[PDB]
Ligand binder design. Sequence first.
Ligand code: HEM
Length: 158
Amino acid sequence: ELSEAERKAVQAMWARLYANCEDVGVAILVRFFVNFPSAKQYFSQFKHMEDPLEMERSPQLRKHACRVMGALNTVVENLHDPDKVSSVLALVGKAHALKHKVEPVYFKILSGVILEVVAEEFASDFPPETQRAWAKLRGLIYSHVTAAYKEVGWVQQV
Ligand code: HEM
């Protein structure tokens, strides 16, 4: 669950990744909405944009990219401060369960998409001990997020 080594491997990798916050977050979102056009339903601005071209460029989408990337950054950066991470995700988890009401599973799905991009950006040096280190940040994120959902006794509505 993220050694000292792992924590730095992920950290360096994301560092070079976040220095591109902009295009990378957008590529993730746009790609998430193409694979699962139904998570687009939660966004009142994309619920209808179907052409990933309109998306790719849109300043709002770019905004939600800004947010997702920023939050992840805080997690990754304070990845050694159990408390800090637990907090950013609790805050993020409850906002999505109670305010936006995104069914929890999308998180896991959205995380895979994120790693897919990471793995592509570093297809050059994506080692087993490193890919294995990202799988943790992934499982760490989700469980934390579903803990928030669980604590609020989440039920999605009809
Ligand atoms: C990687 C994990 C995610 C992070 C860090 C994240 C982060 C954020 C942040 C920081 C905001 C700002 C608003 C606030 O905090 O209340 C936000 C809004 C929002 N997020 Fe996420 N999010 C994540 C995943 C998702 C997923 C998987 C969905 C589902 C499809 C989603 C749907 C939304 C919606 C619908 C809003 C409100 C957007 C709007 O209407 O302006 N988020 N998110």
